[PDB]
Amino acid sequence: GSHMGHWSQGLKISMQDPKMQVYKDEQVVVIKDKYPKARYHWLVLPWTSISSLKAVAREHLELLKHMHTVGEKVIVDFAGSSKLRFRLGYHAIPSMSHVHLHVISQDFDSPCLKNKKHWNSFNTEYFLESQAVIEMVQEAGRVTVRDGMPELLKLPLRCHECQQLLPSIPQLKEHLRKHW
DNA sequence: GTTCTAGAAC
DNA sequence: GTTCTAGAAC
Ligand SMILES: Nc1ncnc2c1ncn2[C@@H]1O[C@H](COP(=O)(O)O)[C@@H](O)[C@H]1O
Ligand SMILES: [Zn+2]
Numbered sequence: 099g100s101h102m103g104h105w106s107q108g109l110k111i112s113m114q115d116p117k118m119q120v121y122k123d124e125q126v127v128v129i130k131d132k133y134p135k136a137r138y139h140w141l142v143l144p145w146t147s148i149s150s151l152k153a154v155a156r157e158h159l160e161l162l163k164h165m166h167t168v169g170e171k172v173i174v175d176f177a178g179s180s181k182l183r184f185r186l187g188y189h190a191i192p193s194m195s196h197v198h199l200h201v202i203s204q205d206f207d208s209p210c211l212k213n214k215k216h217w218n219s220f221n222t223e224y225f226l227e228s229q230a231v232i233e234m235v236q237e238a239g240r241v242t243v244r245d246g247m248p249e250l251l252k253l254p255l256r257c258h259e260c261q262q263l264l265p266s267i268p269q270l271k272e273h274l275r276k277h278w
Numbered sequence: 279g280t281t282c283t284a285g286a287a288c
Numbered sequence: 289g290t291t292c293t294a295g296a297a298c
Contacts (some may be wrong), residue, residue, distance in 0.1 A: 099298095105279055133280075193279045212280095213293075266288095266292065281297085288291070 108132075109196045113143050121172055125164055128172050128201075133210040135220060138177050138184070138203040142169050148197040151188055151231065151241040159235050166228045169201040177203070186228040189219055190247045199228055204258065206274055213267060215251045221258045222250045 101107065112118050113127050120140065121128040131139040142165045148154060154162070169186045177184075183204040192198070202220065211217065218224060224247055234241055255264045259277040264270040 108279070210280095215294095268292075283296100284294100286291100286293075288289105 106193065106195050109141070109143065109194045109198060110147075113196070120176065121168065123168070125161060126168050128168060131200075131202075135208050135211045135216055136203040136206045137208065138173075138180075138182065138201075139208070140169070140172055140201045142166075142172075142199040142201060143196055149195055150192055150197060151226075154197065154231075154235055154241050156235060156239050159232070162228075162232050162235060165199045166232065169199055169228070172201060185220075185225070188226045188228065188231055190224045190226055190243045190250075200225075205278065206258075207278075211267075211271070214255060217255055217267070217270065218251045218253050221256070222253055223247075224250045 102110075112129050112132060115129075118129040118132070119127055120130060125146075126142055126144050128140050128142050131141055144161055144165065146161075148158065166186060173184050180203075184201060185204060186199060186201050188199060200220075206217075206220070226243075231241060255267070255270045256262065257264065257270070257273055257277070259274075262273065264273055
């Protein structure tokens with residue numbers, strides 16, 4: 099198929115769709131994740147095209163920090179009274195093109211969460227904290243990731259709240275209800 | 279990334 | 289027999 103129509107290019111379409119946008123400024127847009135992996139799951143994307151964290155440099159440091167600040171503001175404005183826990187961060191190896199910050203509530207209560215890769219992408223070192231990426235760019239001038247990231251996706255399923263081992267996705271999803 | 283579904287795991 | 293995972297997608 100075409101390059102523009104390839105599944106990996108999907109964010110470039112969604113980020114311009116008014117029905118998916120929840121916030122816009124001169125630098126970034128925030129959209130609802132199309133397949134949210136928790137009750138609240140947004141993506142913050144810069145208007146300017148940066149393919150992934152591999153292409154990030156110190157010229158982008160202000161922008162990365164702004165993405166983070168905007169993520170925090172969205173949490174306050176859309177979920178403030180919920181007092182839920184959120185994490186903000188980046189997948190170590192993303193699937194979709196165009197740099198995007200995940201802003202995600204820690205209930206992980208969603209039918210879109212369906213497999214081990216989903217779980218481990220948000221709940222192991224595969225999930226790079228936004229603050230960590232920012233500090234890495236500031237100090238080293240670029241984002242590097244260690245070997246072994248794909249193997250992390252195959253780790254046994256463990257609750258992020260109490261660290262209990264669960265044998266399957268359905269059993270994990272049922273266990274997570276206990277932490278509401 | 280998702281959709282579908284064969285066949286493994288239970 | 290049903291649940292569950294994991295790989296092909298031309
Ligand atoms: N067409 C789309 N529009 C909006 N979000 C998407 C689309 N396709 C995938 N996603 C989400 O974008 C994220 C991409 O994850 P990653 O590239 O692994 O950081 C996931 O949370 C997906 O649910
Ligand atoms: Zn637990």
